[PDB]
PDB file of C-alpha atoms and ligand atoms in Angstrom:
ATOM      1  CA  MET A   1      -0.009  -0.009   0.039  1.00 36.86           C
ATOM      2  CA  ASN A   2       2.165   2.806  -1.302  1.00 36.25           C
ATOM      3  CA  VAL A   3       1.058   6.119   0.238  1.00 36.67           C
ATOM      4  CA  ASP A   4       2.796   9.485  -0.309  1.00 37.87           C
ATOM      5  CA  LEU A   5       1.502  11.612   2.567  1.00 37.69           C
ATOM      6  CA  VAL A   6       2.143  15.257   2.976  1.00 37.68           C
ATOM      7  CA  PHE A   7       1.519  17.257   6.210  1.00 39.72           C
ATOM      8  CA  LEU A   8       0.640  20.911   5.479  1.00 41.89           C
ATOM      9  CA  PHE A   9       0.665  22.740   8.757  1.00 42.60           C
ATOM     10  CA  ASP A  10      -0.329  26.193   9.753  1.00 41.62           C
ATOM     11  CA  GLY A  11       2.478  28.462  11.180  1.00 43.94           C
ATOM     12  CA  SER A  12       0.594  31.760  11.419  1.00 42.85           C
ATOM     13  CA  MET A  13       0.718  34.277  14.190  1.00 41.70           C
ATOM     14  CA  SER A  14      -2.681  33.211  15.541  1.00 42.43           C
ATOM     15  CA  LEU A  15      -1.305  29.901  16.835  1.00 42.31           C
ATOM     16  CA  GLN A  16       0.140  29.953  20.411  1.00 40.46           C
ATOM     17  CA  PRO A  17       3.579  28.398  20.845  1.00 42.04           C
ATOM     18  CA  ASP A  18       2.220  25.359  22.588  1.00 41.67           C
ATOM     19  CA  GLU A  19      -0.411  24.874  19.882  1.00 43.42           C
ATOM     20  CA  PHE A  20       2.200  24.838  17.137  1.00 45.46           C
ATOM     21  CA  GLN A  21       4.282  22.287  19.174  1.00 41.04           C
ATOM     22  CA  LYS A  22       1.289  20.034  19.486  1.00 45.57           C
ATOM     23  CA  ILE A  23       1.015  19.958  15.612  1.00 48.38           C
ATOM     24  CA  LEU A  24       4.628  18.820  15.417  1.00 47.37           C
ATOM     25  CA  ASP A  25       4.045  16.164  18.061  1.00 47.76           C
ATOM     26  CA  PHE A  26       0.947  14.999  16.118  1.00 44.88           C
ATOM     27  CA  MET A  27       3.016  14.659  12.919  1.00 42.78           C
ATOM     28  CA  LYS A  28       5.696  12.698  14.876  1.00 41.12           C
ATOM     29  CA  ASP A  29       3.042  10.435  16.370  1.00 45.57           C
ATOM     30  CA  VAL A  30       1.621   9.574  12.945  1.00 42.17           C
ATOM     31  CA  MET A  31       5.035   9.001  11.354  1.00 43.89           C
ATOM     32  CA  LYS A  32       6.303   6.818  14.195  1.00 48.70           C
ATOM     33  CA  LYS A  33       3.119   4.707  13.953  1.00 47.48           C
ATOM     34  CA  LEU A  34       3.727   4.141  10.285  1.00 47.82           C
ATOM     35  CA  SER A  35       7.496   3.413  10.424  1.00 50.11           C
ATOM     36  CA  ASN A  36       8.510   0.368   8.433  1.00 48.50           C
ATOM     37  CA  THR A  37       5.494   0.591   6.161  1.00 49.45           C
ATOM     38  CA  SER A  38       5.054   1.645   2.549  1.00 47.19           C
ATOM     39  CA  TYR A  39       4.224   5.165   3.665  1.00 49.82           C
ATOM     40  CA  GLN A  40       6.592   8.012   2.708  1.00 48.48           C
ATOM     41  CA  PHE A  41       6.151  11.501   4.276  1.00 47.67           C
ATOM     42  CA  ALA A  42       6.840  15.103   3.438  1.00 49.78           C
ATOM     43  CA  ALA A  43       5.979  18.212   5.515  1.00 49.36           C
ATOM     44  CA  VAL A  44       5.373  21.839   4.619  1.00 50.26           C
ATOM     45  CA  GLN A  45       4.862  24.759   6.951  1.00 51.01           C
ATOM     46  CA  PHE A  46       2.740  27.543   5.576  1.00 52.24           C
ATOM     47  CA  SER A  47       1.995  31.076   6.788  1.00 51.40           C
ATOM     48  CA  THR A  48       2.655  33.953   4.410  1.00 51.11           C
ATOM     49  CA  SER A  49       5.082  31.805   2.493  1.00 53.01           C
ATOM     50  CA  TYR A  50       5.612  28.039   2.099  1.00 55.44           C
ATOM     51  CA  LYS A  51       8.531  26.166   3.484  1.00 53.35           C
ATOM     52  CA  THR A  52       9.152  22.547   2.792  1.00 53.88           C
ATOM     53  CA  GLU A  53      10.501  21.177   6.118  1.00 54.79           C
ATOM     54  CA  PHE A  54      11.414  17.854   4.450  1.00 55.86           C
ATOM     55  CA  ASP A  55      10.718  16.178   1.150  1.00 54.45           C
ATOM     56  CA  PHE A  56       9.966  12.522   0.614  1.00 56.80           C
ATOM     57  CA  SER A  57      13.577  11.889  -0.263  1.00 56.96           C
ATOM     58  CA  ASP A  58      14.662  13.351   3.065  1.00 55.82           C
ATOM     59  CA  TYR A  59      12.232  11.000   4.744  1.00 54.51           C
ATOM     60  CA  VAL A  60      13.589   8.075   2.896  1.00 53.81           C
ATOM     61  CA  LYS A  61      17.137   8.931   3.847  1.00 51.40           C
ATOM     62  CA  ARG A  62      16.469   9.416   7.547  1.00 50.19           C
ATOM     63  CA  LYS A  63      13.145   7.866   8.582  1.00 49.75           C
ATOM     64  CA  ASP A  64      13.506   9.819  11.826  1.00 50.15           C
ATOM     65  CA  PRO A  65      10.655  12.211  12.637  1.00 51.46           C
ATOM     66  CA  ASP A  66      12.530  13.926  15.439  1.00 50.52           C
ATOM     67  CA  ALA A  67      15.670  14.620  13.184  1.00 50.77           C
ATOM     68  CA  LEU A  68      13.375  15.705  10.276  1.00 51.01           C
ATOM     69  CA  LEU A  69      11.501  18.363  12.306  1.00 55.60           C
ATOM     70  CA  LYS A  70      14.369  19.408  14.685  1.00 54.42           C
ATOM     71  CA  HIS A  71      14.915  22.812  12.982  1.00 52.95           C
ATOM     72  CA  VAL A  72      11.243  23.800  12.405  1.00 57.11           C
ATOM     73  CA  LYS A  73      10.650  27.448  13.347  1.00 53.92           C
ATOM     74  CA  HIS A  74       7.191  29.006  13.816  1.00 55.48           C
ATOM     75  CA  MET A  75       6.802  31.579  11.014  1.00 54.72           C
ATOM     76  CA  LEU A  76       4.308  33.659  12.814  1.00 53.80           C
ATOM     77  CA  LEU A  77       2.759  35.427   9.853  1.00 56.08           C
ATOM     78  CA  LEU A  78      -0.390  35.037   7.683  1.00 55.12           C
ATOM     79  CA  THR A  79      -2.493  32.016   6.673  1.00 53.42           C
ATOM     80  CA  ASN A  80      -2.177  31.698   2.861  1.00 53.49           C
ATOM     81  CA  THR A  81      -3.899  28.318   2.613  1.00 53.86           C
ATOM     82  CA  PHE A  82      -4.715  28.581  -1.198  1.00 57.52           C
ATOM     83  CA  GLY A  83      -1.139  29.370  -2.069  1.00 54.89           C
ATOM     84  CA  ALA A  84       0.025  26.675   0.396  1.00 53.72           C
ATOM     85  CA  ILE A  85      -2.136  23.822  -1.141  1.00 51.79           C
ATOM     86  CA  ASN A  86      -1.111  24.785  -4.718  1.00 54.52           C
ATOM     87  CA  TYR A  87       2.507  24.685  -3.535  1.00 57.73           C
ATOM     88  CA  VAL A  88       2.067  21.152  -2.264  1.00 54.48           C
ATOM     89  CA  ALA A  89       0.472  20.012  -5.558  1.00 51.52           C
ATOM     90  CA  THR A  90       3.199  21.455  -7.760  1.00 54.67           C
ATOM     91  CA  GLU A  91       6.350  21.656  -5.589  1.00 54.76           C
ATOM     92  CA  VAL A  92       6.123  18.684  -3.240  1.00 54.79           C
ATOM     93  CA  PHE A  93       4.507  15.807  -5.201  1.00 56.66           C
ATOM     94  CA  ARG A  94       7.412  15.567  -7.680  1.00 59.62           C
ATOM     95  CA  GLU A  95       9.449  12.436  -8.597  1.00 61.30           C
ATOM     96  CA  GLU A  96      12.690  14.442  -8.355  1.00 59.31           C
ATOM     97  CA  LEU A  97      11.859  14.892  -4.668  1.00 59.97           C
ATOM     98  CA  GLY A  98      11.166  11.259  -4.034  1.00 59.41           C
ATOM     99  CA  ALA A  99       7.401  11.079  -4.803  1.00 58.14           C
ATOM    100  CA  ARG A 100       6.400   7.723  -6.309  1.00 59.87           C
ATOM    101  CA  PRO A 101       4.241   7.466  -9.477  1.00 58.43           C
ATOM    102  CA  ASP A 102       2.388   4.438  -8.225  1.00 59.16           C
ATOM    103  CA  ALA A 103       1.555   5.846  -4.776  1.00 64.65           C
ATOM    104  CA  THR A 104      -1.701   7.176  -3.439  1.00 63.95           C
ATOM    105  CA  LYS A 105      -1.426  10.910  -2.701  1.00 62.01           C
ATOM    106  CA  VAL A 106      -2.629  12.161   0.632  1.00 62.76           C
ATOM    107  CA  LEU A 107      -2.538  15.721   1.991  1.00 63.72           C
ATOM    108  CA  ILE A 108      -3.225  16.356   5.640  1.00 62.32           C
ATOM    109  CA  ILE A 109      -3.895  20.143   6.323  1.00 63.52           C
ATOM    110  CA  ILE A 110      -3.873  21.405   9.914  1.00 65.74           C
ATOM    111  CA  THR A 111      -5.061  25.014  10.582  1.00 64.26           C
ATOM    112  CA  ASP A 112      -6.691  27.267  13.238  1.00 65.74           C
ATOM    113  CA  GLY A 113      -8.660  29.556  10.886  1.00 66.22           C
ATOM    114  CA  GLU A 114      -9.754  30.656   7.429  1.00 66.58           C
ATOM    115  CA  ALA A 115      -7.397  31.441   4.630  1.00 66.57           C
ATOM    116  CA  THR A 116      -6.060  34.916   4.322  1.00 68.25           C
ATOM    117  CA  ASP A 117      -5.593  34.532   0.606  1.00 66.33           C
ATOM    118  CA  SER A 118      -7.849  33.516  -2.315  1.00 65.38           C
ATOM    119  CA  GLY A 119      -8.075  31.622  -5.569  1.00 64.53           C
ATOM    120  CA  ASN A 120      -8.707  27.955  -6.214  1.00 66.36           C
ATOM    121  CA  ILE A 121      -7.024  24.637  -5.376  1.00 65.98           C
ATOM    122  CA  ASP A 122      -7.992  22.850  -8.614  1.00 66.52           C
ATOM    123  CA  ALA A 123      -4.414  21.714  -9.145  1.00 66.05           C
ATOM    124  CA  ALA A 124      -4.595  19.622  -5.936  1.00 66.51           C
ATOM    125  CA  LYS A 125      -8.117  18.185  -6.298  1.00 63.36           C
ATOM    126  CA  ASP A 126      -7.150  14.688  -7.267  1.00 63.62           C
ATOM    127  CA  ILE A 127      -5.163  14.372  -4.049  1.00 59.91           C
ATOM    128  CA  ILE A 128      -7.039  12.807  -1.052  1.00 57.44           C
ATOM    129  CA  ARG A 129      -7.321  15.788   1.254  1.00 59.47           C
ATOM    130  CA  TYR A 130      -8.170  15.920   4.939  1.00 61.95           C
ATOM    131  CA  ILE A 131      -8.277  19.213   6.781  1.00 62.05           C
ATOM    132  CA  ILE A 132      -8.116  19.466  10.597  1.00 59.58           C
ATOM    133  CA  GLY A 133      -9.565  22.715  11.778  1.00 61.24           C
ATOM    134  CA  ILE A 134      -8.791  23.502  15.402  1.00 60.23           C
ATOM    135  CA  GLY A 135     -10.188  25.912  18.020  1.00 58.39           C
ATOM    136  CA  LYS A 136     -12.493  28.820  18.571  1.00 59.67           C
ATOM    137  CA  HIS A 137     -12.847  29.832  14.900  1.00 58.41           C
ATOM    138  CA  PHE A 138     -14.765  26.612  14.094  1.00 56.91           C
ATOM    139  CA  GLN A 139     -17.367  26.409  16.837  1.00 55.83           C
ATOM    140  CA  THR A 140     -20.389  26.942  14.506  1.00 56.39           C
ATOM    141  CA  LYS A 141     -21.569  24.806  11.589  1.00 58.34           C
ATOM    142  CA  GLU A 142     -21.312  27.987   9.410  1.00 55.61           C
ATOM    143  CA  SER A 143     -17.643  28.613  10.357  1.00 56.24           C
ATOM    144  CA  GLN A 144     -16.797  24.884   9.900  1.00 53.80           C
ATOM    145  CA  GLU A 145     -18.155  25.067   6.371  1.00 55.31           C
ATOM    146  CA  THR A 146     -15.414  27.369   5.250  1.00 53.32           C
ATOM    147  CA  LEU A 147     -12.976  24.426   5.418  1.00 52.68           C
ATOM    148  CA  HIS A 148     -14.936  22.176   3.107  1.00 52.10           C
ATOM    149  CA  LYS A 149     -13.552  23.677  -0.085  1.00 55.84           C
ATOM    150  CA  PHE A 150     -10.111  22.489   0.833  1.00 56.13           C
ATOM    151  CA  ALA A 151     -11.041  18.830   1.481  1.00 57.47           C
ATOM    152  CA  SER A 152     -12.129  15.734  -0.359  1.00 55.61           C
ATOM    153  CA  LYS A 153     -15.838  14.763  -0.470  1.00 56.77           C
ATOM    154  CA  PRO A 154     -17.763  14.297   1.759  1.00 57.98           C
ATOM    155  CA  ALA A 155     -16.779  16.820   4.445  1.00 58.55           C
ATOM    156  CA  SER A 156     -18.308  14.456   6.998  1.00 57.86           C
ATOM    157  CA  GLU A 157     -15.300  12.184   6.458  1.00 59.12           C
ATOM    158  CA  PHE A 158     -12.543  14.561   5.331  1.00 58.64           C
ATOM    159  CA  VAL A 159     -13.041  17.627   7.545  1.00 60.40           C
ATOM    160  CA  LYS A 160     -12.082  17.096  11.245  1.00 54.45           C
ATOM    161  CA  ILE A 161     -13.125  19.785  13.682  1.00 56.22           C
ATOM    162  CA  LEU A 162     -11.331  19.839  17.126  1.00 54.68           C
ATOM    163  CA  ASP A 163     -12.150  22.052  20.089  1.00 58.00           C
ATOM    164  CA  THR A 164      -8.511  22.553  21.194  1.00 61.56           C
ATOM    165  CA  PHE A 165      -5.028  21.503  20.031  1.00 63.55           C
ATOM    166  CA  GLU A 166      -5.073  19.108  22.979  1.00 63.55           C
ATOM    167  CA  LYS A 167      -7.548  17.051  21.064  1.00 62.71           C
ATOM    168  CA  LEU A 168      -4.943  16.184  18.436  1.00 59.97           C
ATOM    169  CA  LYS A 169      -3.772  13.431  20.814  1.00 61.93           C
ATOM    170  CA  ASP A 170      -7.263  12.101  20.827  1.00 62.79           C
ATOM    171  CA  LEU A 171      -7.549  12.310  17.049  1.00 64.28           C
ATOM    172  CA  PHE A 172      -4.303  10.236  16.714  1.00 69.23           C
ATOM    173  CA  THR A 173      -5.695   7.602  19.110  1.00 68.45           C
ATOM    174  CA  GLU A 174      -8.647   7.214  16.843  1.00 66.50           C
ATOM    175  CA  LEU A 175      -6.659   7.328  13.548  1.00 66.09           C
ATOM    176  CA  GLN A 176      -4.052   4.785  14.771  1.00 64.65           C
ATOM    177  CA  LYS A 177      -6.857   2.210  15.061  1.00 63.70           C
ATOM    178  CA  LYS A 178      -7.425   2.548  11.302  1.00 66.54           C
ATOM    179  CA  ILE A 179      -4.003   1.067  10.580  1.00 64.84           C
TER     180      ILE A 179
HETATM  181  C1  2IC B   1      -8.687   6.888   6.527  1.00 66.56           C
HETATM  182  N1  2IC B   1      -7.622   7.911   6.567  1.00 66.56           N
HETATM  183  C2  2IC B   1      -7.616   8.833   7.417  1.00 66.56           C
HETATM  184  O1  2IC B   1      -8.368   9.081   8.322  1.00 66.56           O
HETATM  185  N2  2IC B   1      -6.409   9.622   7.175  1.00 66.56           N
HETATM  186  C3  2IC B   1      -5.940  10.616   7.893  1.00 66.56           C
HETATM  187  C4  2IC B   1      -4.625  10.715   8.355  1.00 66.56           C
HETATM  188  C5  2IC B   1      -4.208  11.771   9.186  1.00 66.56           C
HETATM  189 CL1  2IC B   1      -2.565  11.943   9.687  1.00 66.56          CL
HETATM  190  C6  2IC B   1      -5.050  12.870   9.470  1.00 66.56           C
HETATM  191  C7  2IC B   1      -6.406  12.728   9.163  1.00 66.56           C
HETATM  192 CL2  2IC B   1      -7.502  13.884   9.683  1.00 66.56          CL
HETATM  193  C8  2IC B   1      -6.874  11.671   8.368  1.00 66.56           C
HETATM  194  C9  2IC B   1      -5.733   9.069   6.139  1.00 66.56           C
HETATM  195  O2  2IC B   1      -4.762   9.451   5.595  1.00 66.56           O
HETATM  196  C10 2IC B   1      -6.463   7.743   5.678  1.00 66.56           C
HETATM  197  C11 2IC B   1      -6.606   7.665   4.237  1.00 66.56           C
HETATM  198  N3  2IC B   1      -5.994   6.442   3.759  1.00 66.56           N
HETATM  199  C12 2IC B   1      -5.186   6.412   2.531  1.00 66.56           C
HETATM  200  C13 2IC B   1      -6.133   6.201   1.301  1.00 66.56           C
HETATM  201  C14 2IC B   1      -6.381   5.108   0.714  1.00 66.56           C
HETATM  202  C15 2IC B   1      -7.382   5.270  -0.363  1.00 66.56           C
HETATM  203  C16 2IC B   1      -7.872   4.255  -1.323  1.00 66.56           C
HETATM  204  O3  2IC B   1      -8.764   4.541  -2.136  1.00 66.56           O
HETATM  205  O4  2IC B   1      -7.269   3.177  -1.258  1.00 66.56           O
HETATM  206  C17 2IC B   1      -7.806   6.568  -0.430  1.00 66.56           C
HETATM  207  S1  2IC B   1      -6.909   7.598   0.634  1.00 66.56           S
HETATM  208  C18 2IC B   1      -4.916   6.202   4.751  1.00 66.56           C
HETATM  209  C19 2IC B   1      -5.600   6.555   6.117  1.00 66.56           C
HETATM  210  C20 2IC B   1      -4.756   6.654   7.263  1.00 66.56           C
HETATM  211  C21 2IC B   1      -3.365   7.192   7.293  1.00 66.56           C
HETATM  212  C22 2IC B   1      -2.747   7.347   8.573  1.00 66.56           C
HETATM  213  C23 2IC B   1      -3.347   7.011   9.732  1.00 66.56           C
HETATM  214  C24 2IC B   1      -2.610   7.129  10.900  1.00 66.56           C
HETATM  215  N4  2IC B   1      -1.967   7.197  11.959  1.00 66.56           N
HETATM  216  C25 2IC B   1      -4.626   6.434   9.715  1.00 66.56           C
HETATM  217  C26 2IC B   1      -5.299   6.293   8.543  1.00 66.56           C
END
């Protein structure tokens, strides 16, 4: 089961330091669970700009989530989600970076709010896309709906809403069962 999975995680100024750390720990939890499988991983932080923290070929070389994320620094700027998702589609899923032609493409987006930019994500639409929206900005059904445009269909499966960043641990507990 070859899966190329990318974490696209929010580094905007609205995240508290401990919240940003909980995202990193969540990504490590998932990668450790899937060590020695046919999964490959890449990770991109987005805020105003988009930084690839590691590509698939970095993961293949190291297979060490702690080492791969050791130097991540919280950008503390905007939340340009449209640009970020397009970036993943065109700049991360590439064979030259270790992506596999035969693999199933998965994108896991983690964010605390609405995009600050605009456009479309059509270039990424064939990727299986989950989005995890966390915190006070997604308490109403109306506010939760703003995330649907980024995720695969139906939203009932592919959009996860969490009350706090502490619930990422609980989400992992549930996800790990699906392995
Ligand atoms: C179920 N599901 C799922 O919840 N998420 C998921 C993972 C993460 Cl980090 C956050 C969120 Cl929020 C959602 C996933 O990535 C999958 C989709 N599937 C790959 C696919 C296979 C096919 C197919 O048609 O064969 C389509 S997509 C593999 C699943 C999976 C991957 C990793 C863990 C763990 N730990 C548990 C399950």
